[PDB]
Design a protein around this ligand. Structure first.
Ligand SMILES: [Ca+2]
Ligand SMILES: [Zn+2]
Ligand SMILES: [Zn+2]
Lengths: 400, 400
């Protein structure tokens, strides 16, 4: 039983209400811990890799999307409303507002690349009949980011973007196929732009040494792309990760930068990219991927403290308290139920560790640590040894 | 000394009054401050057993008819049709949290339930009334709803006062307390209002602090303790509230099973509360409060590495990287400017610390630490000493 809708109920992660907000998700405490941990995983790498998170508005005057050129095509699937007799809408994507920020920042070449990351809430007006769990939603957050760079920087930025994907997907336990899609018949921008960018893309792909397939003429109207199809442990494929070059928004927003239209000024290239895709969808994939057996650094339920008998409950609670104060996601079972009943019950919510506290542990001021994977032998640790162990199982890092 | 001016001079945030008046574009450094302010609160949530959740942003307007917000709030709501049915963007979290409580279906053993939510809220303020971060259309509250038994009201209100006292003390604010009582139009009987106002009054009396009556400003669903803070400029701000709500539990048919409207069930009481008020407003106040000289743990610009000459740039970069890997918000100036000019330039952005790196520092594997307050003498420290100093200036803690 691995459907994410079922796991979201069984593991008390999230639920939907089809009468008050069909297509959006209610994330219970445990679900919200997973959601935020997935984003914080990405953020930890953002710091390592010089991405700068920004915060942008959610609602805009529809002039923004008339500027960006998205209005005619997206209006039908956007939530739109009048504000003082002007047409506004909820954002279905982040890119236009990032162009406004780039414009404001007004950088020179010495400050390129600029890498604006944004986890902002997005909305699309999906038909009610199409709605399905976390896979087809009206409300989602993306690990979205835009790299603004010189044409000469494309190769190195795309190579770093590929490395970033390889790191995250490998830590989530996915494999993946790479696809390069090149200039379609109808295309915005000059041929020299496309040739220069396609060579840099091809060059980055080659430098990884990984296999990759060419899809000639399947690029976007506004730029070539690399598509990444990932494969979960059920051997299903998902298109979550994207690297999409964009010659159009630089022109439409009149983006420019002084070098080493205007003279002496070139246009930046925009790289749209995402790794998780939508946190909502990646959450679903991972839950089905693992059957709900999440790794310690994603898990909402990291360690439960189980008292063998009432006599050790107070000591057992002090252990849970310190673990909570140290930032771990813990709970306790201090009922009069037998210790074996307490273990079986705690298998149900997939706790990564079970801390068994009996008289021997309270006497020697130690803890008995058991793993959800019962093939790993138990350990008798001091609280400080426990904390050191737990601390070594935070986010995997690309510099560690 | 105006937060809008500070946000521009310190490259924190800006406003685009043409594409999104009333919302805010947070630049990288501003978003760092925003998230740190929330992180501060989140740390206290963990200490104080609040559980963050995530709720939709858009809802069928049936929800606000159920909750009773609909009549008085729709004028200020962003409202739109979804498949011929009236929906809106949420301007508060409470109704969604009632939906979640009902789903959770707790017993007395799980009370209190403390749902915290930083979700994005929207209110349609008149454009002629908008004012930077002080009067906005878009904001995130440090919102939380405590669902507790009637018997738990005094202890939970006591703790909510204690939470607020702690936060404001660490931020350096004094404050005045007000009991806002029965407004003209309200839900529930005058007897229910009598019980609720006297419960809040009793909590207020136990604090031993002065407080004042505020007739007419209670919420339509119950009375509230309102807190006005005073900043260093001797200007007052309403940020904090603790509201006692017997009425929404009835609107939503919330019940919980007891130890000994259904038999064996009682309605929970909701305590609404916020301390920051909104990250937007509190950010503005703290900026003005400090004139932009933020404490180390809030600053988005904690230390900048300044190389004295080209020879020490590579070593100085290693110092920057290590600090960044250790979680600190750092940068570097590796330009050809003289060290005195680098120090003056960096002062403009109110870096808490400057790390002066010459060949003497490189040779001995040390840094020269200069404080933003140049009355504090410079120190010569190793990298490990520096990191110990920095680590000791993290989020103030109510258990530290
Ligand atoms: Ca954070
Ligand atoms: Zn984009
Ligand atoms: Zn509320």
């Amino acid at each position: 039983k691995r459907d994410h809708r079922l796991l979201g109920s069984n593991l008390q992660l999230f639920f939907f209400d089809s009468n008050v907000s069909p297509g959006s998700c209610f994330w219970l405490p445990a679900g919200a811990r997973l959601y935020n941990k997935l984003m914080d995983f990405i953020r930890n790498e953002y710091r390592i890799r010089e991405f700068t998170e920004v915060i942008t508005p959610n609602i805009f005057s529809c002039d923004l999307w008339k500027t960006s050129g998205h209005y005619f095509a997206y209006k039908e699937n956007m939530f739109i409303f009048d504000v003082e007799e002007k047409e506004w809408g909820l954002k279905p994507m982040n890119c236009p507002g990032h162009c406004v920020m780039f414009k404001h920042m007004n950088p020179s070449y010495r400050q390129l690349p600029i890498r604006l990351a944004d986890f902002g809430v997005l909305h699309r007006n999906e038909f009610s009949g199409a709605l399905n769990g976390l896979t087809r939603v009206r409300r989602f957050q993306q690990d979205d980011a835009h790299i603004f760079c010189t044409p000469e920087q494309i190769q190195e930025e795309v190579f770093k973007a590929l490395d970033f994907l390889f790191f995250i997907y490998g830590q989530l336990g996915f494999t993946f196929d790479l696809f390069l899609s090149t200039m379609p018949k109808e295309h915005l921008g000059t041929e020299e732009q496309w040739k220069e960018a396609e060579n840099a893309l091809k060059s980055a792909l080659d430098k990884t040494g990984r296999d990759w397939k060419l899809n000639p003429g399947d690029g976007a109207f506004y730029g070539p792309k690399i598509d990444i199809m990932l494969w979960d442990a059920l051997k299903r494929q998902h298109q979550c990760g994207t690297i999409q070059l964009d010659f159009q928004l630089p022109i439409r927003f009149n983006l420019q930068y002084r070098t080493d239209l205007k003279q002496g000024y070139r246009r930046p290239v925009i790289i749209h990219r995402a790794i998780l895709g939508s946190v909502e969808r990646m959450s679903a994939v991972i839950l089905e991927h693992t059957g709900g057996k999440l790794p310690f650094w994603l898990s909402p339920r990291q360690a439960i403290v189980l008292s063998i008998s009432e006599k050790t409950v107070e000591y057992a609670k002090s252990v849970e308290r310190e673990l909570c104060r140290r930032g771990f996601d813990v709970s306790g079972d201090y009922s009069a139920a037998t210790i074996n009943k307490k273990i079986r019950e705690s298998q149900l919510l997939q706790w990564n560790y079970m801390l068994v506290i009996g008289e021997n542990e309270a006497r020697d001021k130690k803890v008995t640590l058991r793993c959800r994977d019962t093939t790993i032998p138990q350990e008798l640790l001091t609280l400080d040894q426990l904390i050191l162990k737990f601390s070594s199982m935070g986010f995997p890092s690309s510099i560690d």
